[PDB]
Design an enzyme around this catalytic site. Structure first.
Site, PDB file in Angstrom:
ATOM      1  CD  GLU A  35      -2.775  -0.642   0.183  1.00 53.24           C
ATOM      2  OE1 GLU A  35      -3.207   0.409  -0.520  1.00 53.24           O
ATOM      3  OE2 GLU A  35      -3.856  -1.630  -0.151  1.00 53.24           O
ATOM      4  CG  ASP A  52      -6.603   5.309  -1.066  1.00 55.27           C
ATOM      5  OD1 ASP A  52      -7.695   5.667  -0.491  1.00 55.27           O
ATOM      6  OD2 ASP A  52      -6.422   4.452  -1.804  1.00 55.27           O
ATOM      7  CG  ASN A  59     -10.895   6.143   0.103  1.00 56.78           C
ATOM      8  OD1 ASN A  59     -12.134   6.523   0.067  1.00 56.78           O
ATOM      9  ND2 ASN A  59     -10.192   6.475  -1.023  1.00 56.78           N
TER      10      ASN A  59
END
Ligand SMILES: [Cl-]
Ligand SMILES: [Cl-]
Ligand SMILES: [Cl-]
Ligand SMILES: [Cl-]
Ligand code: NA
EC number: 3.2.1.17
Length: 129
Positions: A35, A52, A59
């Site tokens: 991520e 994000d 988010n």
């Protein structure tokens, strides 16, 4: 802050993420790797106008307030900026809410596509925990 692999594993454990909702520590470290590349300051804008934030790329459409995501919620009751801190407490507490939401870690696209079903224990291997 850019965490190291084992350094993040230890911080996640201290904040109670290890085995939270049945997801072993390696799942969380793997999710953070893909991520954010372990970078607490990571931000990425989504096509829908949400953004994000942080090591787990939480988010603004649902979870935090950034003032520029119309119609969104703030279910973690935090400014999205709090998810960028060197201290991961806010991201961990919010992630705990997300992973209890119903779909588990599938909420993290990178986890589903790159961690789910893989040898996630590799991400904590060799770490002094
Ligand atoms: Cl693991
Ligand atoms: Cl907003
Ligand atoms: Cl921390
Ligand atoms: Cl689950
Ligand atoms: Na929001």
């Amino acid at each position: 802050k850019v965490f190291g692999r084992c350094e993040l594993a230890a911080a996640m454990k201290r904040h109670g993420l290890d085995n939270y909702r049945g997801y072993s520590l390696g799942n969380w470290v793997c999710a953070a790797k893909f991520e954010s590349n372990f970078n607490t300051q990571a931000t990425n804008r989504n096509t829908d106008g949400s953004t994000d934030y942080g090591i787990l790329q939480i988010n603004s459409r649902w979870w935090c307030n950034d003032g520029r995501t119309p119609g969104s919620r703030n279910l973690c009751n935090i400014p999205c900026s709090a998810l960028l801190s060197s201290d991961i407490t806010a991201s961990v507490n919010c992630a705990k809410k997300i992973v209890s939401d119903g779909n588990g870690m599938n909420a993290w696209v990178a986890w589903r596509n790159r961690c789910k079903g893989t040898d996630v224990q590799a991400w904590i291997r060799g770490c002094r925990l």
